Design a protein around this ligand. Structure first.
Ligand SMILES: *[C@@H]1O[C@H](CO)[C@@H](O[C@@H]2O[C@H](CO)[C@@H](O[C@@H]3O[C@H](CO)[C@@H](O)[C@H](O)[C@@H]3O)[C@H](O)[C@H]2NC(C)=O)[C@H](O)[C@H]1NC(C)=O
Ligand SMILES: *[C@@H]1O[C@H](CO)[C@@H](O[C@@H]2O[C@H](CO)[C@@H](O[C@@H]3O[C@H](CO)[C@@H](O)[C@H](O)[C@@H]3O)[C@H](O)[C@H]2NC(C)=O)[C@H](O)[C@H]1NC(C)=O
Ligand SMILES: *[C@@H]1O[C@H](CO)[C@@H](O[C@@H]2O[C@H](CO)[C@@H](O[C@@H]3O[C@H](CO)[C@@H](O)[C@H](O)[C@@H]3O)[C@H](O)[C@H]2NC(C)=O)[C@H](O)[C@H]1NC(C)=O
Ligand SMILES: *[C@@H]1O[C@H](CO)[C@@H](O[C@@H]2O[C@H](CO)[C@@H](O)[C@H](O)[C@H]2NC(C)=O)[C@H](O)[C@H]1NC(C)=O
Ligand SMILES: *[C@@H]1O[C@H](CO)[C@@H](O[C@@H]2O[C@H](CO)[C@@H](O)[C@H](O)[C@H]2NC(C)=O)[C@H](O)[C@H]1NC(C)=O
Ligand code: NAG
Ligand code: NAG
Ligand code: NAG
Lengths: 412, 134, 185
């Protein structure tokens, strides 16, 4: 079964890369302005220093994650002023200078769907990220402009200019299809690419569950913080929950029991919160590493790993940013309408047996031809497309035919 | 952090107020001057602000400065619909990568760590379950 | 973990001998129980931290094993995996609780631009390169490989014919040299 047409397809993948940084003060959360609470908690050891160290480590680890997936090339490139990429239309991915935001229409659509207080209280602080969105957008724009005008060369050394049709011809001659197919159906390929890239906005704007992966971490963090805050209204087996009333209607020789019980309860609650945060950060870092690998392999070069950079034979990929995440658009090539054929392992001329150099033998029913393994184009068997090895006695299923000779003119 | 530059002297004193005061997204920075240029990043602060020593520059007057990010050197390739850039030489390069594989093995005895020679501590801890075996 | 032993944990003292001396057995159990609870939870925290660190260490070890299996015992075509640039070879070295990889790679160098053409149109037929692309000095035309500059004269061995000079865009005119000319003699 040999395909006779093809179809360019575009798929989307979403990968989280970071989670919001946060920090809590050990002393302030447990004890307020009460100094007696402070010097009662001083009885315990370094339980107010390990937690801050762990949170700081988590914060710096999250800071490092973004730099690994967006700082592959330290040389920002610019697109040419005139867009004449052989009919291709990269308007929905390239940045739009008209809008005050430096994003693209797809990036703008993404940033308007992540939308779902907590200013400051009880020693709850949120640190700002080192890299703002305005610079992640610049990194993505530079990466996008690098592949359009240079191919995969800029990912290994100096950037080499290349015409886009020639680059696509290079990429087809990486999966089996020869060069002439693109140079013939340039218009069809361009139209299919434009339609596929257009349909992405419609697909994203209609599915609320498309961006579900990025919302899960935000919701989990919000629920964890809400539980941590709500845990402050529990008596923990004492007479009350507010230290002020404990300090009033009791004696200092007796009031320490409630203070100690509340301290123990709040300390173990904070322990649970910190452990949960560390466990979540582990998976977030794993996902960030996977995203970095995907960016390095799919974008800056063609990948031959099956079902890694999209579904089907991989051709190209484009990166886009999103709030605490990245989105990959994989452009792939898949076969189409097929045809029925009969075959033969080898062709037996006089004595010698012929094997194809590249491609296989297909029989229309009367004649025979040799063709490629992924696109149907028959050619007459000659001495250039086949090589002789052995005799028509050991191979199984060989057939009979005539191998054309290309030097018949010399007879004249 | 998160303190607006008026309340800062409501906390060896020059760093409390005066000299040069800069207000950023992270907070209030005291002791550095905000230049109008852009350089490679250094000791980070936040919201794309890196502070560097970099004061070899009318005496040099070495001091700490603050500046915005610079995302590498600007570049632009000349692209037309007929243009090829073919290399003519090459260069063999060697790079190094470091990878941890393991750390030091260790073991801690449950009973000895908590209770010393005191058998009373031992038989009081025996009240709990299998916490010295897990 | 060691310094945590010098904390009273809300008791009267931190040394068990002192607790066992200036108290009564019916009363001394409270301090012992409190110290036991505190030390037990401290050890719990230490063990949990050790497990969390060990997970990451195992992940890094697995990555190092994959790198050794792929980059060393064979060439790798994965981009930016075994070093920066086109990967050629790699060498392993040991280090205290770790490994060091030396990646030997190939990168291009000084460059000169050229002008190209998708195909060359001889009489009727249209010729496409077999490997490499067409490079024009400005007067003549040549075919060369895609990673090193060495011009060669267009022949019938470096190109293959497919179609007509009517559907491709940007085809140009030139002469395809024939290799059986001496047969005329
Ligand atoms: C490259 O792609 C861009 C984006 O699709 C093209 O711009 C778009 O071109 C279409 C052409 O039909 C415009 O649609 C027209 O809009 C006007 C005004 O709303 C309407 O009266 C017409 O009936 C038609 O629907 C569209 O506005 C325009 N801009 C977008 C979609 O943002 C561009 O033309 C493409 N390049 C080339 C060379 O065609
Ligand atoms: C493809 O064509 C070849 C040659 O045209 C066929 O080879 C022939 O195979 C038959 C039996 O397989 C043999 O023919 C015999 O030859 C002896 C020679 O003395 C003769 O006495 C017999 O009466 C008989 O004709 C022989 O191996 C060979 N013949 C010749 C002339 O080469 C082959 O069978 C064909 N295969 C198919 C699938 O059609
Ligand atoms: C590369 O070579 C081809 C073949 O020589 C050139 O194609 C020529 O195109 C012109 C007009 O586009 C045509 O010539 C015309 O032929 C008719 C035949 O009756 C004649 O009456 C006209 O007066 C005119 O000469 C024809 O398609 C073809 N020339 C020939 C002799 O077949 C092509 O232009 C060349 N490339 C470049 C860039 O010049
Ligand atoms: C494919 O299967 C068919 C069906 O069995 C094979 O046809 C038979 O092949 C044997 C082997 O020589 C002959 O003896 C029979 O006479 C054939 N039957 C018919 C109806 O033709 C066929 O050979 C198989 N193909 C190959 C390459 O082995
Ligand atoms: C490469 O780009 C140039 C710039 O537009 C193209 O040159 C024009 O091509 C059209 C189409 O035939 C002509 O009508 C113009 O007269 C050309 N202008 C000049 C100044 O020559 C050129 O055709 C493009 N080449 C390819 C292969 O697309
Ligand atoms: C495919 O093989 C031949 C066509 O050469 C045809 O007779 C046969 O019925 C086809 N089989 C199917 C399942 O279509
Ligand atoms: C900080 O204080 C000044 C003067 O009191 C005020 O104008 C400014 O708006 C304050 N900062 C913010 C972020 O409001
Ligand atoms: C490309 O090379 C030509 C000479 O062949 C030269 O005239 C032109 O300036 C070069 N292009 C660039 C961008 O340097």
């Amino acid at each position: 079964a040999i395909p006779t047409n093809f179809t360019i397809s575009v798929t989307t993948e979403i990968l989280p890369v970071s989670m919001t940084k946060t920090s809590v003060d050990c002393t302030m959360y447990i004890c307020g302005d009460s100094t007696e609470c402070s010097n009662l908690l001083l009885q315990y050891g370094s339980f107010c220093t390990q937690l801050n160290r762990a949170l700081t480590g988590i914060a710096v680890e999250q800071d490092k994650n973004t730099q690994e997936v967006f700082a592959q090339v330290k040389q920002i490139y610019k697109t040419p002023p005139i867009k004449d990429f052989g009919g291709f239309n990269f308007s929905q991915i390239l940045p739009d200078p008209s809008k005050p935001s430096k994003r693209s229409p797809i990036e703008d659509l993404l940033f308007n769907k992540v939308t779902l207080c907590a200013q400051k209280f009880n020693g709850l602080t949120v640190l700002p990220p080192l890299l703002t969105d305005e610079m992640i957008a610049q990194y993505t724009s530079a990466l996008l402009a690098g592949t359009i005008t240079s191919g995969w060369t800029f990912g290994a050394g100096p950037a080499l200019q290349i015409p886009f049709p020639m680059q696509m011809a290079y990429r087809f001659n990486g999966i089996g299809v020869t060069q002439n197919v693109l140079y013939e159906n340039q218009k069809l390929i361009a139209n299919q690419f434009n339609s596929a890239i257009g349909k992405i906005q419609d697909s994203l704007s209609s599915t609320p569950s498309a961006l579900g992966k990025l919302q899960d971490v935000v919701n989990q963090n919000a629920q964890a913080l809400n539980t941590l805050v709500k845990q402050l209204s529990s008596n923990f087996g004492a007479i009350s929950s507010v230290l002020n009333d404990i300090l009033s209607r009791l004696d200092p020789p007796e009031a320490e029991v409630q203070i100690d019980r509340l301290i123990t309860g709040r300390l173990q609650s904070l322990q649970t919160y910190v452990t949960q945060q560390l466990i979540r950060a582990a998976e977030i870092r794993a996902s960030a590493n996977l995203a970095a690998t995907k960016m390095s392999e799919c974008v800056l070069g063609q990948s031959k790993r099956v079902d890694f950079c999209g579904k089907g034979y991989h051709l190209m990929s484009f990166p886009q940013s999103a709030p605490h995440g990245v989105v990959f658009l994989h452009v792939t090539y898949v076969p189409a309408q097929e045809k029925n054929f009969t075959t033969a392992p080898a062709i037996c001329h006089d004595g010698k047996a012929h094997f194809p150099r590249e491609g296989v033998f297909v029989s229309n029913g009367t004649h025979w031809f040799v063709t490629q393994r992924n696109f149907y184009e028959p050619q007459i068997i000659t001495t250039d497309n086949t090589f002789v090895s052995g005799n028509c006695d050991v191979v199984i299923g060989i057939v009979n035919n005539t191998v054309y000779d290309p030097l018949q003119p010399e007879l004249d | 952090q998160d303190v607006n530059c008026t309340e800062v002297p409501v906390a060896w004193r020059v760093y409390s107020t005066g000299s040069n005061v800069f207000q950023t997204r992270a907070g209030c920075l005291i002791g550095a001057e905000h230049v109008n240029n852009s350089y490679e990043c250094d000791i980070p602060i936040g919201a794309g602000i890196c502070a560097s020593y970099q004061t070899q520059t009318s005496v040099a007057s070495q001091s700490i400065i603050a500046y915005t990010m610079s995302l590498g050197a600007e570049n632009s390739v000349a692209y037309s619909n007929n243009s090829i850039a073919i290399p003519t030489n090459f260069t063999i390069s060697v790079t190094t990568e470091i990878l941890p594989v393991s750390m030091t093995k260790t073991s801690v005895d449950c009973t000895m760590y908590i209770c010393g020679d005191s058998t009373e501590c031992s038989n009081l801890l025996l009240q709990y379950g299998s916490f010295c075996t897990q």
